[model samples]
Target chain A: RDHQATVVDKEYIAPHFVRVRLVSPTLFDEVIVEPTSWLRFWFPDPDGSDTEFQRAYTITESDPETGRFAVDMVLHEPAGPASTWARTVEPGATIAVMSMGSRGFSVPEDPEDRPVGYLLIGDSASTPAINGIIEVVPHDIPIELYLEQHHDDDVLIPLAEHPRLRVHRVSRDDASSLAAALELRDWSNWYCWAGPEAGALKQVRTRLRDEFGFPKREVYAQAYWTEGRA
Target chain B: RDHQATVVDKEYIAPHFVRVRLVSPTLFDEVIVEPTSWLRFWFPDPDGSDTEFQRAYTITESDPETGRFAVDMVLHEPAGPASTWARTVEPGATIAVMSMGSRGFSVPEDPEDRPVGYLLIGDSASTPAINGIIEVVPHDIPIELYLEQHHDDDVLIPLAEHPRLRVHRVSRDDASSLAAALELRDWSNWYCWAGPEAGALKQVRTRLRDEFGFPKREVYAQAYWTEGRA
Candidate 1:
């Protein structure tokens, strides 16, 4: 079933990046509550193809008590229909959002058993889920990050400064920076967590287990996007 | 004057990421030294366009005394000339590097008068500079960061956790989450520092001054990339 969500506000946190605040009494109504929850949105088929352009976005922030939540959209390249719609979508416009009640990236079952440090990795596409994982993870867990970047402004996404968190930037224009960064340190016992891109995810998963010898149970890697397909 | 830098070593830091270690006794021979210093590299023209594709990269870790430095590259998208060359570039391959000694992001001249807090933001492209800034700033200064993301593996970038640093992740797919995160705080006197994409940079700059009333001197914003153009 589809629910209605109204665009309440739109803002640009960085270039090509827009955040649309959506309000809907039924939003997240039927969705399962968990870290990295997401929903699918069907936009109007202006071309009359009868095929609605569907896009999935993470629930970046939500206030269930207030009946309001927000989704972030990246507008660039191929200029997909969803991005085109978001570029000019104004407040009061209603769209159909389907909540499959999805769940993602869970912490270890026992808090006491959590690793001393976390190796977090990702790019723009998977950040929403990354944020969700960060929110649910224990604050004291040391986090070492290797983030790939397109434009510089991507740094504007909020990250906390704690003794437990460290961030490194890898240039997208360079062919092999992220993996090189991983080599800068030794991750023998750290919990390896990753998502966003499939090609990179596959490589990291293998390296964590084979090269670093990370326990399979301690490593969590998910493919948020496939390279050739998307 | 241009200098030659030979790829001495190449390693994977992440799946789609590579770290290229270059050695050039003459690399920084003529340039001004500063935090987040970048050099331009001219690669072989395989397409016979007779035009060299020049790209700038940060010196991720450097030891001028040893005449050794490293740069991280992410392999994805558009498959530009630089990335393509990097993909097959051999260890013996030597490239032309122009170290005009380009400098970026300096801290306040008078550290004695520096503020108690800072709002630092950027993504992967600007993170090398961000890292430079972080290295230079006083350890006691509070830093609030809003970083954007593309893939989940981005966390592989090294970010230090400190009591003075607060980090938040915003979806690049989301248009306004970074700005929204800024709204969560009242940055009346904090030093607002940022680099990266132009679109989000403009918005955050405006909000910092117009909305939050941060002094221009306290708000330092630089453009690392322009949408559509890059």
Candidate 2:
């Protein structure tokens, strides 16, 4: 009831991003929408091997009315199994959602004072999650976004915009650029949500606790994919 | 070369933030434009009790060609003496700059791994210094900014934005927010920069060292003003 998605449609939103529409009444019924909700996709071996690979993508868009959701597959330079499946999979083909939620996103509702805005950091790999979480945010709250682009067309991925939102371009393949950008601002009162490269996210996460003194529940970061790994 | 400014222009960027323009050929000539450069301002005691008070503010803006600089004073609630002075001061009225530099903000560029990003936390009082450093940064570098707002209109204090920059809002009058938020994000591989309330900043800074283990050079913090202190 919580792990099956049937593709209803697929289209190219941009050169580097493909929107794959899915309908999952069972999964949607059990999966509650949170700021950071993702589905672990089980993709059959592209090489026709018996092996199946697991890739997780954030729930990019959701519709409670129709029990529908969508994901924008990032076409990495060297396409992986997940990218290949999304690129060639036909409508009505089904994929499996291995899990229902993320490691758990903590958004502290009551702090000493009301938070003024939010901050999100990630790469093209995490755009699905970043975009998904952004839509759920209250409109008035400002958002600071950073994305590390891998290709020229990655910038073609359209995003939600508001008066207080700013999308920043981060250095490609370098997590430090993302880490550096996070260090330069005053974002103490925020609900920070980020999902990026696995190793890079760990670097940023460790630094947050060791160098900055941030606690859990104040900022939530998850690794959507790993760098240099399929 | 120090301790002098003749107000040239004053304008409200927001009700909470006022821009005070000044002309200082001597100060500008001797004081090189260093990121985090600030001038200690000597404001005459509004009480006229044969006394003058010293307030340190981040140098908000600087012009190489015009030999001019500015400060965005956060019109604090109930209007402290500095806020009172910024409110009542007239064009051409002379003020004073007590120093040519801050305690000296240090940005440790050495990260054998290449710095990931930078993190800065402050209130409106430190915006000038934060803005000063941002102007001097490389375009590709990313910045994570946090500011504790004192009033609703404090957002009116104009700030420069780069492709890789984000402005985060933090809880005000609560330095705990600074410490907590800093603890929540990725601070590793970041050149962290922050300054705000004297006591609160001290608390946050101490947490960085004792709780998080950030080195002295990796993070720099200055007290812009004190709480409940004249």
Candidate 3:
């Protein structure tokens, strides 16, 4: 049930990103799949209705040497079109991937001298930003993170081994639990927060500053997703 | 440049909260400051470094009515204590208030069948859980709000009377400004959002939800006030 659809068109897109082409018998257009980015799509159901679906993936072998890359499909119980593409799509299969263009992320430039500490908060939706930031943060400054996950089965991302990278796990109990911690912690020089949707993200930032009173100049926040959407 | 070396009692005060009344030069204490509560303290210059010469406040009167309270102070600015106390404290000198006992605004409970609707959103220090769900609510739901302010200025409160309730204004930003046409554009849902501190109360929740999305709940946001003694 994990992947119910297959890749229709597959091509090597860009570095750190792949363009997977796929089509669905039930759904229309060829949705482009970015293995490294989140795939949010609305698929047709057996009842002739539509349901929203989202997932994150990474290419196991983005063969820059061969122009061939493979995306890992965890064939789990949650059956969906994306899962189908991940499971059944063959190398030559003319699958259809939703066509979405070059989407970018939001990461402001960092200051020269890094602060002694920092904090990063987000969920699976934020894995991209988290990966980039962790890979680049300096060797001295501390980094504390709170990541939201759907289940324990979710893959554990290995943050670059550094002197200061603390990650907290928030099992998909509810977005509200993140707010609970923000109300109690003390953020130092620089902090960045991003996550799914606007509702909870808005709630978290309000408390982080008003309750904590950290200087605005030192904090950065973004909403990676919106309600009913992100 | 924006710090006061006030001796903060770092040792956890078991209760996690304390309320000291300034009835005299030094003689009032309460376990907790309750609702309808008002704190009249001499706000120091955010840029002081002397702990010994830090100013003191004399609570002029503790009126549980209207939440209007007062404080008295004798401070030395420059290299001494904060100058705000001397500049803004006097008889009937309710240099505004910043209290804790009182919680932010709340929304109605019935959800299955309601009147029209309401939207909500709040920062950690602002509305909290009380307002996040109420801000962008769609529909003609009747709504009302009472925001906690950091300054005693009227410019910051967005003014536009709706069929439900005229949004009340409260803040510490004497120069804060809100465009008049904001409310008329529709903020049906009352949301609650609070910040770790005051200010930015309207920024986080107002734009994304009410301005962009279809307001669905009562949105309420409050910046709890980030001003703290270093």
Model 2 misplaced stretches (Cα beyond 4 Å): A1-230, B1-3, B63-67, B101-114, B183-186
Give, for candidate 2 chain A, the lowest lDDT window spanning 10 residues.
Answer: A104-113
After superposition on all C-alphas, the RMSD of every candidate to the true structure, in Å, is 23.8, 18.7, 20.8
For candidate 2, the docking band is: incorrect
Please write out the lDDT profile of model 3 over residues A94-187, one tens digit for every residue. Answer: 3223323324333336655455566777765465556556656676766767666554333333333444455455554455767665425456
Off by over 4 Å in 3: A1-80, A87-90, A93-116, A155-160, A197-199, A213-230, B1-230
lDDT of 2 by residue, B1-230 (tens): 45567999998976677889988766766566566766778788888875777776666677856768887787886667788899999998998785544555544475444457777788777777787777666667777777776664454465654545555565554657666655354566677787778867887888777876677868777677777876
lDDT, model 2, position A5: 76
What DockQ does every candidate get? 0.02, 0.01, 0.01
Error of 1 at A2 (Å): 2.7
Best by DockQ: 1
TM-score of chain A of each: 0.84, 0.85, 0.55
Question: Scoring only the second chain, what is candidate 3's TM-score?
Answer: 0.27
By DockQ, the better pick of 1 and 2 is: 1
For residues A1-230, write the lDDT of model 1, one tens digit per residue. 88888989998855777888888776655454566678789887656576877778778768776658888787756666677777889999888887774656676788777777788888776676666777667777767777777664465554433333445667754434455557545765678777646767766776777778888878777776655464
